[PDB]
Structures are given as C-alpha cells and as structure tokens.
Amino acid sequence: MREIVHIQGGQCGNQIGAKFWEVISDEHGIDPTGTYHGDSDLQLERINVYYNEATGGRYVPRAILMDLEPGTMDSVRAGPFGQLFRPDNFVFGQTGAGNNWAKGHYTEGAELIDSVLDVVRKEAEGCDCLQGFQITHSLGGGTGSGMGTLLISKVREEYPDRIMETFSVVPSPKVSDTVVEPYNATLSVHQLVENADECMVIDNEALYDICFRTLKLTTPTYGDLNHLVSAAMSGVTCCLRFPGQLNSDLRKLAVNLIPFPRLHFFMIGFAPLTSRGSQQYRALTVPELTQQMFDAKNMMCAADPRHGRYLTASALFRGRMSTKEVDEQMLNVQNKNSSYFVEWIPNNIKSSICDIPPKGLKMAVTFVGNSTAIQEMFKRVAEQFTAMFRRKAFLHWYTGEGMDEMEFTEAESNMNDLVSEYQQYQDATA
Amino acid sequence: NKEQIKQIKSKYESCLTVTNLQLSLDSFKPEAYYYLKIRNSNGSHKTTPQNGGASMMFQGDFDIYFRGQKIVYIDVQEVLKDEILDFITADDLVGIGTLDFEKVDINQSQQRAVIRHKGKQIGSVQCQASYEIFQSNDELLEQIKNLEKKDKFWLSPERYQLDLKLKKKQILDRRQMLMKNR
Amino acid sequence: MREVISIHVGQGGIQVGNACWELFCLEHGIQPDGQMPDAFNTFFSETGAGKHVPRAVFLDLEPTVIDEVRTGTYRQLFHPEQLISGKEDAANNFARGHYTIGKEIVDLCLDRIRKLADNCTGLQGFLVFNSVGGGTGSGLGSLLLERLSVDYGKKSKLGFTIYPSPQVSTAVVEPYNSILSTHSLLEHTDVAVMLDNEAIYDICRRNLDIERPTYTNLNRLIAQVISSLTASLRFDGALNVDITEFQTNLVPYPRIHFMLSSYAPIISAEKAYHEQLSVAEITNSAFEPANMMAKCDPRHGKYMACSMMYRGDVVPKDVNASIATIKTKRTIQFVDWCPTGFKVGINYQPPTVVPGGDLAKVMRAVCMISNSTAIAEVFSRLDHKFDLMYAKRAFVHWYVGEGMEEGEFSEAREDLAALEKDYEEVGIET
Amino acid sequence: MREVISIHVGQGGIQVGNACWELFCLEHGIQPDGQMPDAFNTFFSETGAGKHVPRAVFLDLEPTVIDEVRTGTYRQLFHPEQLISGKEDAANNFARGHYTIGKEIVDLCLDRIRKLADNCTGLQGFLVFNSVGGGTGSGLGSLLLERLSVDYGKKSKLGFTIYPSPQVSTAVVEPYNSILSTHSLLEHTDVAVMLDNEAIYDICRRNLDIERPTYTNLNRLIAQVISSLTASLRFDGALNVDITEFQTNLVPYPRIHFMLSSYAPIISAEKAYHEQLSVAEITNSAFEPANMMAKCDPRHGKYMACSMMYRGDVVPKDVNASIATIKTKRTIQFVDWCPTGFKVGINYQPPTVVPGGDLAKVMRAVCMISNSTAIAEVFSRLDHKFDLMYAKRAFVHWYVGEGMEEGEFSEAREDLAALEKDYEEVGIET
Ligand SMILES: Nc1nc2c(ncn2[C@@H]2O[C@H](COP(=O)(O)OP(=O)(O)OP(=O)(O)O)[C@@H](O)[C@H]2O)c(=O)[nH]1
Ligand SMILES: Nc1nc2c(ncn2[C@@H]2O[C@H](COP(=O)(O)OP(=O)(O)OP(=O)(O)O)[C@@H](O)[C@H]2O)c(=O)[nH]1
Ligand SMILES: Nc1nc2c(ncn2[C@@H]2O[C@H](COP(=O)(O)OP(=O)(O)O)[C@@H](O)[C@H]2O)c(=O)[nH]1
Ligand SMILES: [Mg+2]
Ligand SMILES: [Mg+2]
Is chain A adjacent to chain B, meaning 3+ CB pairs within 8 angstroms? Predict the structure, then answer.
C-alpha cells in the first residue's frame, strides 16, 4: 500500500538510479536475478512499495527509464543489477538534444513523450493506493532538464492530488562541465517551482568536498557520489517500508516542512560518515549523530547554512534508540543555536524514529532542512545567466527551434522574484 | 509556362524581378561601353552594353531565383567594342554593388545599390524590384530552339552542326575579348 | 545505432585519411584485410559475414594518390567504387574545381553519399578533410558542402581544414583560393578547425625531438586528435559528449565557428616513463601557447569557450582541481560575458599506439578544442597577402578564363572584412 | 499441367533463344544431351523414357544459324524437324518476308505449332522473340502473329522485341520495317517489351565493367529476365503471379501495352560479396533511370502501373517497407487516376548462375516490368527518322517491287500518330 513509482531521465538521473536500485535491492536481499535470499521476515512485508510481482516468483522494479539517446540505457543494462529493469520500460530516441533545452522540450521531447507517458499511465493506474512519484534528473543537461520538467507538468495535470518528489542536481560554478549550463538551469527552475511538491538540490561540488574532507579517500569517482546520493534517497522512505515508533510518510513531511506553497527547496545530508581508518575509533551515539547532522560541511550543497536562518528542520533517525534522548538532543541543538532559527515559528524541528537500521550500520540519520541560505545558489545562477544573456551569446541555438527571448525574460524575472520572496521571510520579525 | 513555373516554384523559395536599372558613376569614359552583370548564388544575367554617359538606363526584366541567401551582386563591366566586327574584345570590372533583399522594404518599388571599387564608392545603381515568395550568337540560339520545337528527337544532325558552329563562335569571341584586354 | 561519414578530398585530405584509417582499424582490432581474426558501428558497417567496410569516400581529380591507395596493403578494405577518381587535375586553380571539371564528378560523389546514408539509421553528422591551399581540394570541398547543405539541411558537418602557414608556403597562389574557400565555407560549415603545418612542425621538433619530419608524422598527430574527439561515441565514459552537443557550447554566434586545437601529452618512449604524467601537468601543457596546433598566439586575445576531452583513468575531482588552477592564472583571461567557459568530457579508453610511430603508450591524455578571439590574426595576414597581388590583378587571368566572374574576388574580401569587424565587436566588454 | 510455347524467328531471335535454352536446361538439371543424370513440365515434355524435348520452335529463312545450332553441343536436344529453315534470306526487306518467301514457309510452322499444342493440356500462352530491324524477323513475326490471332483467338501472346537504338544502328533501312512491324503487332500482341541494345551496352559497361561486350553477354541478361518472369509458374512461392494475370494489372487500355523492363542486381563476383545486397538497395537500384533495359528516361513521364518480381529469401514486410520509400520520393510520380500501382510477386528459388558467364551467385534479385508514359519518345524519334527518307520516297522501290502497295506506308504513319496522340491523352490529369 501507499507505494510510489520511479521515473528517471537523462544520463545523470540514469546513473543515480543505477545505484539507488542496487542499494534498495541489497537492503531487501534481492539478488541481481530477482530472487529473494533475505534473512528477516520484515524484508518481505512491505516489498510492494518499490517492487512488482511476476510469475515465477521474481520481482521487478516499477521504474521508467527515458533518454533522448540510447547509449546510457544500453550501458546501464550491462552493469550489476541491470537485468531487474523490465525491457518494455526502456524508451529512447535516435537523435538526442545536445544539451539544448529547446530541443529537449519543444521539438524532440514533445513527440517522444507520448510513449513514455503511456507506460507511466499504465504503471500508475494499476497500483493499489498511489502515494506519489519521485523524479531524478539533472539541471545541467538539455534533454534531462527539458523532458523531465515537461513530464512533471504533464503528470501534475493528471494527478493534482498526489505528491511529487524531484531530486535535482543544479550546475555549480566551481565544477563546470558545460558552457550552456546557466540557460537550461534558469529555464528549468522556472517550470520546477510551479509543479513540484518537493525539490531536493544536490551539487557535485559539495559531494567532492565531503568525499575529500570527511571520508578522506584519495580518488573520488562518480560511484561514490552516486552511493552517497543513493543512501540519502533511501533514508527518506525507510519508515514507510519498516515499522517504527513514529511512522511518517512523505505527505507528513510535506505538511511539516513547507510553510508556504512556493518554499519547497530543501538541502539534505546523511550521517554518520567516517573514514575507513577511523571507523573503529568512533562510538555511535545520538549526540555523535546529531552533532554531525547539523554540521555545515555535511550538507549535500555548497550553500553555507550559517549564512541564514532555518525556517524548519527534519530528522529521520534509524535503529533502535530511546526517544527521550532524541527529543532532549533536538531541544539542545535548538537552544544553543537560537540565532540561526527563525523566531516567529516555535518548535520548528521534526523527528521520527525507525527501528530498522541500514545493513551494516547500527544507527543512521537523514536530515532535511528548509533554510533561507539556499538563496545564494539562485543568486549565482542568475548572475551567470544575466552575464551571458546581455550579449545574446549562444541564443541563436535556442531561438532557431521556436523559442524566443520573451520566455527568457519571464524566466529571469520569476526566478529573481522567487529569490526576493524567499529572503523576505528571513528579515521578517514578530 | 504553367509546368515551367511549377518546376521553378518547386526548386526555389522566392523570386525577385529587377527592372529599370539606372547606372550613375562618378566618372564615365565617353568612348567605353558598359553592361551590368546581375548575379546571385544560382546564376547571372547580363544587360546589353550601352555607351558611357552621365546616367545609363538598362531596359529588361531580370528574374532572380533564391534558395537561401537573398543577396544580389550588380557587377559594372566596362567593354571595348570593335565597331567593325560587333564583338566584345575585353571586359574590365569597374565595380560591384550589393543588394541585400532582407533589408529591402516590400513597400518601396525603388532600390539603390552603392557601387564600390577597392572599398571606395564610385557610383550607384537604382532599380525597380518586385518580390514573390513561392550570323549573331542570338540568331544561332534561336535556330537551335526552333529545331528543338520541330524535332521529337533531342539530337538531329542539323542541331549538332549548329551547336558546333555556336561553340566555335563563342571561342572566337572569347579570344577577341582576351586580345582586347591585352 | 550512431554513425558518422568522413569525406576526404584532395591530396592532403587523402593522405590524412590514410593516417586516420590505420589508427581506427588498429583501435578496433580489424586487420588490414578487413577481417577480425559492438563499438565498430560508428565508423564501419557489417557485411553479414566477415569483413567490415569503412563509412568513408575518397575524392580526387588527379589519379596518382588513389592508385597508390588501391595497390597498398589496404586494397582489400575499401569498397572498389567509392574511391572516385578523375583524369585531369585542377592544378591549384580554384575556378577549375568549382566550375569546369568538378561539376562532372560531383554527381557521382553525391550518389555515393546517398548510398552510404541510406544504410545508416542514427546518422550523427559528416566529417570532411581538405587542404585549403589547392585547387581541387578547396573547390570540390566548397561544391560538396554547398550541395549537402541543401540536400540534407540541418545535419551537422565538421571541417578539418589546413590553412597555410604565416610565412612558410609551398605554392605562390594559395592566398587567392584560401580566401575564396573561406568565403564558401563561412556560411556553409558548422565547425572549422585550424590545422596549419608550421605549428605542428614546431611541436614535433620541440617535443618529439625529430629534426627531419615528413607529412606522415603530422598526419598521425591529426589522426590522434580525430580519435580523441570521436572516442566518446564508441566507448563507455563517466561524462559523455556528442557531436550535436557542440554548437550549444562552443559557438556563441552563427558566424563565429573557427577554433584552434591542442593536444597533450606529446612525448617519446625514451623519456616518457621518467615522469608521472599527472592530470594537472598535462592540462597545464595543453594550455601552453607553444603547444597550439595552429600558429596563433592565445595571449593576444580573449577566450570565448573551451571544450576539452580527457581519456584514460582520470578522475573528475582531479579535473576540477585543475580547472580551478587555470582560472587562477593571470596570463589567461576569459571574455566578460562568459563566467564559466569549460565543457569537460571524461572517457575510460586510453589512447592507442601505432607500431613504428612516434608517440608512446600512456594512460592519460587531454585534447582541447578552444574558441578564442585571437584567431583574427590569421585572417588579417591572409587578407594582407591577398591585397598585395590583387592590387595589380596578378594571376587573375588564370581564374577569369575558367568561367569565374571578375567581381567574385571582391565579395570574398568584403566578407573577410565583415568577419574581422565581427570578431572585434564581440571581444569588447560591456 | 501448365505449359508455354516459345517462338524464335530471325537471327537475333535464334541467338537469344540459344541463350535462354542453356539457362533453362541448367536450371532444371537437364544435361545438354537432354538426359537427367515435377517443375520441368512448363517448358519441356516427357518422352516416356529418358530425354526431354523443349517446347520451342526455331524459324529462319537463312540457313547458317540453324546449321550452327544443329552441329553444336545441343544437336541432340531439339527435335530434328522443328528447326524450320528456308533457302533464301529476305535481306532486310520487310515485303519479302511478308509477301514473297514467308508465305511458303508459314504453313509448316503453323503445322508444327498445332502438333506442339495438341500435346499441352493447360496451355498458358505463347512467347515470341524477334529482332525488329530485319526483314525475315519482322515479316515472319507479323505473319505468324496474324495467323495465331485467328487460329486460337483469346490465347495470350508475349513479344520480346528488340527495337533499334536512338542513334546506334547496324542497318540503314531499319526504320521502315520497324514502323511496319509496330503497325502489325499493335493490334495483334497482348504484351510487348522494349529491348534496345544501347541501354544494355551501358548496363554492361557500368556494372559488369566489361569494355568489349559481344551479343552473348546481352542475350544472357535477356535470358535471366525471361527466367525471372516465368519462375512463378514452376517454383513454389508465397505470392504467385500467372501470365494471364497481366492485362488486368499492367494494361489500362487495349492500345497501350508497350512497357520497359529493368533488372537488379547486376554485379560481378570480384566485388559482389563486399556489400550486403539488402532488398531495399536492390529495389532502389531497379528504379534508377540509368538501369532501364531500354534507352528511355522515366523522369520524362508518369508511371501507369509497376509489376515487379522478387526471388530468393525476401520477406514481404521488407518489400512493403521499400514500396513505401519509393512512394515517398519526389522524383518518381505516378499518374493521378492510379492510387496504387504496384503488383508484387515473391518466389523462393534464387537465380541460377551459368558457368563462365558474367553474373555472380546471389540470394536476392528483383525484376520489374513497368508501364510508363515516357515511352512515346522512341515512337517520336523513329517517326522522325522515317519521315526524312519517306519525304523523297527513298528505298521504296525495293518494297513496291515485292508485292506491297504504295499506300501501305502511310497508314502505319497514321497509326503511329494515333498512338502518340493516345499516349498524350492518357497522361493528362483530370
Ligand atoms: N598537413 C598536411 N598538408 C598537406 C599535405 N599535403 C599537402 N598539404 C597542403 O596542401 C596544400 C596544397 O594542396 P594539396 O592538398 O597539396 O593539393 P590539392 O588539394 O589536391 O589541390 P591540387 O593542387 O589541385 O591537386 C599545400 O600548401 C600543403 O601545405 C599533407 O600531407 N599534410
Ligand atoms: N540484342 C540482340 N540484337 C541482335 C542480335 N543480332 C542481331 N540483332 C539485331 O537485329 C537487327 C537486324 O535483324 P537481324 O536479327 O540481325 O536479322 P533478321 O531478323 O534475321 O532479318 P534478315 O536480315 O532478313 O535476316 C540488328 O539491327 C541488330 O540490332 C543479337 O544477337 N542480340
Ligand atoms: N553524480 C553523478 N553526476 C553525473 C554523472 N555523470 C554526469 N554527471 C553530472 O551531469 C552533468 C551533465 O549532465 P548531462 O549528462 O549532460 O545530462 P543529460 O543532458 O540529460 O544527458 C555534469 O555536470 C556532471 O556533473 C554520474 O555518473 N554521477
Ligand atoms: Mg593534387
Ligand atoms: Mg538473317
């Protein structure tokens, strides 16, 4: 019951999913052949959340994979746990977008999306009670940031009451791999605010910083960043698949973390994270988890959370632990940092406990906090956008496929309005 | 005419008809003949040569067909004419005008090309322009066209002899122009 | 399901095509007979049983080079009737190969192009190679590009032209046809890469330590650059780049698409292994002005956008840590309206070595394609060379007598003046 | 229980009959002696024990060719008294072979035809071969057709006539008898196929790469076309076609039954196997104007109906997918009052190869029989050639003195004018 379907688009989203599904399968004891080989009874009670049942007793994820080029899905199939995905759900084009948002949203993405929407509708109509959808995509690419966001609007138009999740990677100015990143980032943020019920920003720069400083491993690769993102993704829905002292589905988090409908851009972090050589030194206790949870360097975004004030915060503890300690520590982390918490909403931290810890760990915490410090990312994105747009650089590529500069002006104005009205509440006082 | 128009409209995106070409140069040679060569990426037309005067008026309708770039060049050519033999002995490029028809006001029937040589202005051509979006050498060509209308076969022995006569004469006229240009 | 067709016209084009086609056959394990004793599909096609046929066509009016090809070791590889050959050479006369003898040959080439294109299903685009300072090369390249631009339309075409050196020259009349061909491909080619011989001679002398190089050594380096550019289409990589993802990242405006390339490392086996060849040092060497593949000084102009490809065991974090260092340096400055200018690609397959060649085997390499404002100097010097002889109308009779009009020389001069004005207008700050 | 009788008259007819009768004997496994060391019944008859006798008759007034036949390796095959031979040749005079010497021979031929027909039980129809530009061929063909049209009535007769080339000619008087024979067979033959020599010479030169062809090479291609046409009667196929199923599909009106043929692929063993010979490429090659078996341009006229035969391992869906592509092309346009114009036949038996011949062994082939409006050009040029000499009454005395009336020349001219007017009247849209 109350299950969700998985939809991913683009190369970055496909690579994120290729590790997210591996993590989920390892958590539920599903072999790469789709056969259950788990140890505990609880591993099968709520498997309908992510997995479907077919004849022969094997399980198949309800994931939908889409891209405008076939290479990435032809590569993910040969990887481990690549056989679980149903071949029918693979939809792709023969041309690609070339990191051009217009091509992936107006000319090419519009004709292809009917086929993927057909299978999306097939998956949603069938399921017992829908909880919602979760979306993984990147804002630095053309086909992803175009087709995914248009699909968001199409899904929202047909299921207005369901919940919608988006895990979005925004292009940081530090590690830049594409010159046209500001254009399709700014165009995508315009559409994303209007339809997504929840959005979670993730930055490659913050992932590299975490890998270099906390784990202290010499050579980070995309596999480590994907593993961290996958652990963070799994931590959110853990209590929906396992029993606990205070169950809290996604809708309950939506109620408690979004004060106003347009303020739904969160930054997350996962604890504990320790190096291989120091994993024996540390002792896992609730104070040790909560001190690392609120650490500024532990956030999955380069945004500095002590440059603003938290509107609200959430924590999803895992493992068996006493609730009194959790509540007193949450109170203590809020009394010692009163300057960084907005004062006109008292008791702005939500807590939840799940009795099933991750495989290999005795305690774990997932942190989701809505803070005013996120304005800095939109500020720098808009700064680069307005630095590049004033000369109409690279504009002809977009304008040759039916798009105009008016949609750029409206997007810039709406993004600046969002930036302004997000900080409006930072200076608000009672 | 309908089938030819249909083939033209299938191959080209638009036509420009140029009429009433008036050449004005800062200096004419009074003893020299001038003609206009009107060209685009798809072909070229030539006016009849006229004697140099303070303003020259070239009559003719010049249909210029486009498939992309809407630029016409007007080359001004000076010609030495041998009055005894009625042939062109040399052709010298005086200057080039450019008409950019994306900038031509659809409401202005009159257009002006500035003629330039080595980057300096040396005159202008004025013309009327309309836009639609979709034995002498001439006697020998007219005889060939009249045989094409009479014979169901593309290669009569008489046509082959006339085509050989035409080619020999064009080589002689080209040699006379190369001799006049020396 | 992704394909590309390479066009080779002229003596220089055929001699660099031979150079790239030993390298591709060696890299995909195909013997010179064409027989193997799913990545080949980008350049080759399967015949059903046994041999592979290249997706390439060789053009020339002068039969000597084709006859040399049809008797060498590669006689069995190419299809017998795609090596189109003429009888009479254009003899360095541009008007000949554009108006007199090229027209009767161009129809067969277009028929061959159609017959090759109907086989491909996912055609990415075309590649073309031609030495500019020759009659048949420049003329037939211009005519083929003009025919293809209307037969196919929006398909992408890439041109690896070899412009004459600043002072070193083999002919005496090459500025005329170089200027005319630049006129022709300015409005007809999507990408043009600079390849003059003098810079590559200096590269060989300084790094490879060869004091008597021949054309084969130059062509092998060009072949390596081509392989590095197209590796991302036929090998798995952490950060892929497609051909269609260029005009959205390197071409700010439709007129400006001439850029100059560089490669690193270039080193011989006698002293390669004594140093570690870290990613930082190779990416520093790639940006050195003396390692430009075209004899132009980047210190004389701004950068617009840099697209640079890695291959081997490089890790993205090391790439970011090196892009930061380059942004730090004061001798390299980017244009004002471009905050980020780097597009990064990472591939896993290390560069392959050709036996008996110059380059050694290494695990890391970098190839950069950079668009800079300094390229206007080559246009200015070619224009100055052209004006000197066009003042007295020298050598013009060799062109007027081949059907070309007198005024055709002037408009190419006007287009070059327009291009030089445009390059100055773009490079000024706001 | 299905039979067909082939008639060979004249030197060209006998020389193409020899060519087809090596091929049939080779295809059915019968040795040249006539002995095998149930499909044969279409062309042959069983004698009770041992040898097979062809259902063919050879006619000529000039004895040299028949004497050559009766001494070659095939002396034992044909029945001794069905090789009817005369004593005096007609010497390119049509009036001779229609009024003077052909009448005394035609009775024996008709007796032989009756003796062969009484043996058959399921007679499909007759085949006739005759080179038109000769006296005995055209005259005896006309007389035989006129006798058969009244002796048998509704039985179908097919004529594989070889008209003279546009400019290449062997005689000087062949337009006269060509026009007269066209007059004779216009109202007497159900199907006439164009076979002029110049087009087949060009085919051999371009594809077979033979620079010095002889008549045997032409006759082998004609024999292959005949075998492809009649394969459906003696081999199992997924989509069969009978001879009687032609006037219902290719002949819109009783007057219009002249059509021109083409064949594909035509390729030598030296370069055949390097390419895959897919059905799409062969069906594209068959429609190429340069591969017409008669020197006429199909681009100059509309199509009326296309009947095209396949043989080998071709699958119907691939045929449909290729008919769609041809309907797509803008250079091939059908007549307005014909929405669908294709009749498709598929057979399983691949074409057989003759040892020492030109063609190689392939698994797929296509033969098309297409009726088009462009055929009027050959009639117009033959008419123009006729008028030039008929203006001065040249060579007429050679015809008036052989019993023909003066006015007989004019009415053939009037019938050709009527045919040309009819072809123009049909091709105009409604
Ligand atoms: N990099 C490189 N350049 C070459 C090579 N061969 C010729 N060139 C250049 O090509 C220019 C002249 O054009 P070519 O390619 O030699 O001759 P072409 O293009 O066939 O033109 P034609 O003279 O009419 O045959 C010279 O200035 C050379 O610089 C080569 O092997 N490598
Ligand atoms: N395709 C082809 N045509 C031939 C061949 N032999 C002759 N012809 C053509 O036949 C025409 C003349 O007719 P022939 O067949 O040679 O002679 P005929 O039909 O027996 O008539 P007579 O001259 O009276 O004997 C010539 O114009 C040739 O083009 C041949 O072997 N193959
Ligand atoms: N975490 C992670 N990020 C990736 C991976 N591959 C690419 N990216 C990021 O995705 C961005 C490029 O997105 P792109 O591949 O063009 O998206 P697309 O246009 O939808 O295919 C780069 O800036 C990378 O930082 C990966 O395997 N893992
Ligand atoms: Mg040459
Ligand atoms: Mg004879």
Answer: no
